Design a protein around this ligand. Structure first.
Ligand SMILES: Nc1nc2c(ncn2[C@@H]2O[C@H](COP(=O)(O)OP(=O)(O)O)[C@@H](O)[C@H]2O)c(=O)[nH]1
Ligand SMILES: [Mg+2]
Lengths: 146, 344, 206
């Protein structure tokens, strides 16, 4: 119909939703497609995880830096884990606009899970602008630990 | 010799109480049953078990109407239940017709199907419609039928005659294999693979390397599959292979203006056309083709009783329409459909 | 924490699960695996009016419409009817879905989705779709594959249910990822798979 009319099922008050991203920093921000890796499928395939703006965040208070991605439209978190010492970007065999990596614990689904990701950017040089910032961000963390 | 609970909408979970068993009394007492119909109910595994035991005994069974019998059952329970039933059916020497349509199967329940279908040699009419087989399982079912072909020649059993397998998304994935299933059963009469997302390349094969070998073919329906020029050309070439063709259902196949053009031309060349019902809806067929199709229907298709062009690319007004309607009038036998939805 | 029971129904092989899947993993499940019976998948969304949870009751497209389906329909509060834009047969069935549905729900928000609009040779074009006009439904061309409008359906129903024409999805609190320590046996064989990955090429579709 033009605009179907229904009388509301509930009454929900306006609300201010925080991001828990306020004590941020946001070193890096660039959109890209993120991938998940097969898992327990015995069939090593790359399953899409999301397409949106990737962000690198360091904590003003503490030091901790994490990766946080949100999908377009839905805004659901498709990647949210800390950057550890033993981590880095390794080109995806073919193509250089993408890098893979391991995370002992991702929290995109608000449940600690071992994710083996891989992100791809529009232009190969954007990947460098990412890896560079990702590396000098992984460095800022090894320097941390003793 | 007929047992049935059709439409009784029974939530048949177990079958153990005094009642429940009473329902299947006619089943228990009479062993000389020919047709069992269970449609319109939800059979759980437990009840499936109890009905398996009580079906093997019915050795004079000829028809198993098992369409729509699981509505509500999860992956957790259908495969088991299906297995038990198909296990029993297998033990019926005279069962030529078995129907399993309108049940959620797909890969997750291909086991009983793959088993049964390859073995049950008495099978003549298979109704596997709207089961969501999928390209993967569809293929296995197709191979499984190729087997049946063999196991059939070994026991000098009747040829398979009807395969009604549509709305299963067989896709092109399984056309390579199905085409072989047909090469196996070249004595089919009714093959209906409607709405299987089969695209052009798929139909080209399925046709030229599959059905084309079934010289005995009487009824063929490939409704709602993308044909296009590629599919059509295949169909055109293949038409000369089915002399006893009587029903050709191509509704919703996007034959394409150019395709229909040829298909029609194809018929134009056929001889002794005993065609009796041609469904050509929604195929972008253009006026120039409908023009020729008419004269052909008139001159060479003396037995046509049904035609269907609704949905194509030619005005409901255009001369040809009346000319066609006129042809059937003069004959006293004929019937064009209502063209209330032409394209463009 | 508000919960809504949404019934996803429609002819088989159209996209119900694929759609729902993507909405909770982002993955585009290309493999067709028939949904036996009904699988209840919950999706949460964050709006300017708090977080809401849709309990998507994904159903099986073979099950003939009738009372045997009542279970799914009962106490629903919205629903999505789906059909394949490349299958005329699948669209022609919409009417039956929307009926076996409104028989127990009577008056509830329903969005009609013509999925797989991404496919080249399309059959049910944008124009021709009228059914929504005659039965008070919202309509959306969609593609679980290209994501085209893939979030409008929920967004709508949400607005309709919540009663806020201007409701919209917003961020999503990004909590602190747990600890992250260990190293011993809890590692090493990871590099083994990390490589089984950097090797396997990514499905480039862009
Ligand atoms: N091209 C295309 N295929 C799709 C789309 N959505 C789903 N599919 C495919 O359609 C098939 C069936 O999906 P499925 O979720 O099982 O549909 P269901 O019948 O509702 O369970 C699978 O082969 C999917 O990959 C889409 O937007 N585009
Ligand atoms: Mg499904």
């Amino acid at each position: 119909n033009h605009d179907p009319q229904f009388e509301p099922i509930v009454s929900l008050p306006e609300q201010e939703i925080k991001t828990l991203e306020e004590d941020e920093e946001e070193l890096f921000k660039m959109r890209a497609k993120l991938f998940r890796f097969a898992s327990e499928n015995d069939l090593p395939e790359w399953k899409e995880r999301g397409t949106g703006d990737v962000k690198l965040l360091k904590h003003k208070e503490k030091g901790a830096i994490r990766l946080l991605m949100r999908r377009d439209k839905t805004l659901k978190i498709c990647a949210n884990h800390y950057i550890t010492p033993m981590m880095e970007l390794k080109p995806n065999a073919g193509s250089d606009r993408a890098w893979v990596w391991n995370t002992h614990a991702d929290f995109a689904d608000e449940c600690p899970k071992p994710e083996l990701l891989a992100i791809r950017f529009l232009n190969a040089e954007n990947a460098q602008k990412f890896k560079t910032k990702f590396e000098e961000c992984r460095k800022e963390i090894e320097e941390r630990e003793k | 010799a007929r047992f049935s609970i059709e439409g009784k909408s029974l939530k048949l979970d177990a079958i153990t109480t005094e009642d429940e068993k009473s329902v299947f009394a006619v089943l228990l007492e009479d062993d000389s049953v020919k047709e069992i119909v269970l449609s319109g109910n939800t059979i759980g595994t437990e009840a499936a078990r109890w009905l398996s035991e009580n079906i093997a005994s019915k050795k004079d069974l000829e028809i198993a109407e098992f369409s729509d019998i699981f509505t509500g059952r999860v992956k957790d329970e259908i495969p088991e239940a299906l297995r038990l039933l198909l296990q029993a059916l297998l033990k019926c020497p005279k069962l030529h017709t078995v129907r399993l349509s309108d049940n959620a199967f797909g890969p997750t329940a291909q086991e009983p199907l793959i088993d049964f279908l390859s073995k049950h040699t008495p099978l003549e009419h298979l109704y596997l419609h709207n089961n969501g087989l999928g390209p993967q399982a569809g293929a296995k079912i197709a191979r499984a039928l190729q087997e049946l072909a063999v196991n059939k020649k070994a026991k000098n059993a009747p040829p398979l005659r009807s395969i009604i397998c549509g709305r299963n998304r067989l896709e092109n994935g399984s056309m390579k294999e199905w085409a072989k299933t047909f090469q196996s059963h070249r004595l089919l009469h009714t093959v209906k693979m409607v709405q299987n997302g089969i695209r052009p390349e798929g139909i080209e094969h399925l046709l030229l390397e599959g059905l084309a070998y079934c010289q005995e073919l009487k009824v063929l329906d490939l409704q709602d599959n993308t044909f296009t020029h590629l599919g059509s050309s295949a169909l055109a070439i293949a038409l000369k292979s089915w002399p006893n063709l009587r029903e050709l259902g191509l509704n919703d196949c996007l034959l394409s203006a150019r395709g229909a053009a040829a298909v029609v031309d194809a018929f134009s060349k056929l001889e002794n056309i005993g065609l009796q019902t041609l469904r050509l809806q929604y195929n972008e067929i253009e006026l120039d083709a409908v023009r020729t199709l008419k004269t052909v229907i008139d001159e060479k298709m003396p037995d046509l009783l049904f035609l269907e062009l609704n949905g194509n690319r030619f005005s409901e007004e255009d001369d040809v329409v009346d000319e066609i309607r006129e042809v059937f009038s003069t004959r006293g036998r004929g019937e064009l459909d209502e063209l209330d939805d032409m394209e463009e | 924490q508000v919960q809504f029971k949404l019934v996803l129904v429609g002819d088989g092989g159209t996209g119900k699960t694929t759609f729902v899947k993507r909405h909770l993993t982002g993955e585009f499940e290309k493999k067709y695996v028939a949904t036996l019976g009904v699988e209840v998948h919950p999706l949460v969304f964050h709006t300017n009016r708090g977080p809401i949870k849709f309990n998507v009751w994904d159903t099986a497209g073979q099950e003939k419409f009738g009372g045997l389906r009542d279970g799914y329909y009962i106490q629903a509060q919205c629903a999505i009817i789906m059909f394949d834009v490349t299958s005329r047969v699948t669209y022609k069935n919409v009417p039956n879905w929307h009926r076996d549905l409104v028989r127990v729900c009577e008056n509830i928000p329903i969005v009609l989705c013509g999925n797989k609009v991404d496919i080249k040779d399309r059959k049910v074009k944008a124009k021709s779709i009228v059914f929504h006009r005659k039965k008070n439904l919202q309509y959306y061309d969609i593609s679980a594959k290209s994501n085209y409008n893939f979030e409008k359906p929920f967004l709508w129903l949400a607005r309709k249910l919540i009663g806020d024409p201007n409701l919209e999805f917003v961020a999503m609190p990004a909590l602190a990822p747990p600890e992250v320590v260990m190293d011993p046996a809890l590692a090493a064989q990871y590099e083994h798979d990390l490589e089984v990955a950097q090797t396997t090429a990514l499905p480039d579709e862009d």
